[PDB]
Protein: BPa0997
Amino acid sequence: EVNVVMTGDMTTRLAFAGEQLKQALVEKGYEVNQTTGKRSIYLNLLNDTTKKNKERFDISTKGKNTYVTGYDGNGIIYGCRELIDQLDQSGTMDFKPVSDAPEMVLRGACIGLQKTTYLPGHAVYEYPYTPESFPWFYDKERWIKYLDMMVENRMNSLYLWNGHPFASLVKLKDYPFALEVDEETFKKNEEMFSFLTTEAEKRGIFVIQMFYNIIVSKPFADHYGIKTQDRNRPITPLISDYTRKSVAAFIEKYPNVGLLVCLGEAIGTYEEDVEWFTKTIIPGIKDGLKVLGRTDEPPVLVRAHDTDCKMVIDAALPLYKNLYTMHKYNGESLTTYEPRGPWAKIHKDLSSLGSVHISNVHILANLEPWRWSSPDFIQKSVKAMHSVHGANALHIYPQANYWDWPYTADKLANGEREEQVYRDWAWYKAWGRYAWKADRNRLEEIKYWDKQFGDFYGIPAEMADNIRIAYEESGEIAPKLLRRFGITEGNRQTLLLGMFMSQFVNPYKYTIHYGFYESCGPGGEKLIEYVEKEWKKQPHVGELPLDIINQVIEHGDKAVAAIDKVVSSAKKNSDELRRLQNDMHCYREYAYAFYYKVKAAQHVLNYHWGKNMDELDKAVPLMEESLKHYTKLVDLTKDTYLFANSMQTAQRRIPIGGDDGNNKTWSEMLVHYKAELYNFKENIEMLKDKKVRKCVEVTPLKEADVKILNNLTKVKIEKGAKIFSNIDGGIDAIAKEITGLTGFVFNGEKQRDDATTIEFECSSPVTMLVAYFKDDHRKFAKAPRLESDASANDYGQAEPVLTNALHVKGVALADIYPYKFKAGRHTLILPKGYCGVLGFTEDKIKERDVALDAPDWLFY
Ligand code: NA
Ligand code: NA
Structure:
């Protein structure tokens, strides 16, 4: 019936290609003969490294013989995948000749050895590889399925993300106490890495271990009496020695595993980033290479995240020639296929290096947790990666629920968990398909996807087009709403839980970073900008917020109308199609809730500009209508989803704090949005009746009784006070709240070199007040930023308490951030650069813009 003949370099990839083709043919009812005149397929593997024929194959046919030429091991695998895809798309062994190669050179996905919350005993990102934490990591069948799916999608790279993996994977003779796992687990970890590298290698998959810096093991830390990580802590010879030896041990022991380096998030300055990479990491890699007898420099991947790419690559290239770069596609979200602005320039500059620049589709904060997999949106995004960013490689996150691998957020009957590889098959398949080839005729793609959805649900392709419509209409909702109304593309925000009125009418209170609105889609106006231009009779430019809410309710209505027609048809995976229908109804109720809230926010902003109280009367029924839609969203999610956000800690700030896993469900959020309307109505009632509103009674904070342990110079905080010993000017404006506190005097120069360490004890909870200056000069310590520093809320400091609150003559204006402590003995290192420590109080601090009457006072 069918002969399969393998010819050439008898490699593991050639042998895998052959087994795959044989299984595919017997699953179609053919008898297969294997060896190394009736129907024959010839698998020919050549030898050439010609970076040009990488992963290339040719298929030709002559009579009843088919010839597959693979230019390398990956080429012969992909040649066999093309025969199998032909056998699937028609039933016949009549093969079409094809010469093909992928457009992007690395095409891959990540799994996080990460959890929804911190491991008891450990800081952020820290999780030893153990079966207690990750039993799925030790499941060989689950690994085979994952790697088989990667081959089907022609993905050639797998990334494991972990804080400090080395202490689970290597033993150091100078630091034997560093090991974070018991001996039996250490043996299981060695066994799994051996299984994973072997299974991946025969499939043409490069395994890459990602790590954060600077992080040391819990037992190494405990032995030396230091912290596992501290962002502002200097580099020390001890921590450098431990990391260099760890990295060298890893290269020696797992010689085919790549490294993805994050120069963060526990490194305080760009100068320390360069020093760590060039003097600790790169020498550790060369140590391991020297030990193996390697003369080549295998690629090292470096994230642009939380560093200065240009300093880093410029300093590193003389020391190590083979560096790949990685940078987020749309920050930690998916917002646009028309990216632009300063962030597009950073991608273009990294692509300029003429090497491999990897587009990272990172975290997908704005899509969590509902189904998302728009072929159109994904195709257009890969076209943008090429045309706007210059990227030639792709790294994708899971579609949702990254922190909770291997499960989705779906709540099934009786505690059952849904697998991400099951639910999100079309996400992986779409990113793989467009990474292979971006330019594909859209009508032919619709027919391809109609058959994929039809086959999965057992529905004719024509009928299944309504599934494709549902994905492509609903797919535009979260991207559009985030880029037009969002606070951030970071997972600091969970878009699909909604937003407060305050976040619509006073968005800059919640800290919007330069770059987001300027990069993450077409140029346009915020709601506050649109309403200001209405009142000032100024022309409108670009994407308008009222246009976007109209578009999103239309997307919502069309997705529901499409999925409702087909949901009853499914002959397979019927429960899954009912969940997709439920997700489309969720997206529609979300879209209408958002529409009415934006309309309400426009009237509240009309009140701000005109002070016509009839504007507040119109806001109420729109808010009520928004709440009717949000109540329906609760009814749709309360039995169907465990939660929205997979990151379930105090690093989540928008719409409200996610501290200790609170505020992660629509049910929880509805309580807040009901209280927001109730409050609004009470405030309007008081305005009508009494023409009064609540405002802050401004009083000095009482100084707390604190003992300073590290010999700081004290100063009374008042007009005239010199908080910088190295400059001539004193405080020349100050919030009354701060006057009379006892702060400190520092040398701004010493602050640039050494950072600022405060050590103190308190017999009750205190807040320490820190001044960060509103000046872009690198001499100033930077205010806490959760998007580039997971530790930026460890003291409750992520948000300022008093804005525009301090001025020092010859310096700048400052905002005041709260650092909160329980009773105890404390040591804090603040970021390098000029900053002020103004004192301590046990008092409740009332938030205030000292420069003022913002339009959101009505929701307090
Ligand atoms: Na850094
Ligand atoms: Na990145």
User: Anything to note?
Assistant: The two ends are 78 Å apart (CA to CA). Residues 263-264, 267, 273, 306-307 surround sodium ion (ligand 1) (CB under 6 Å).
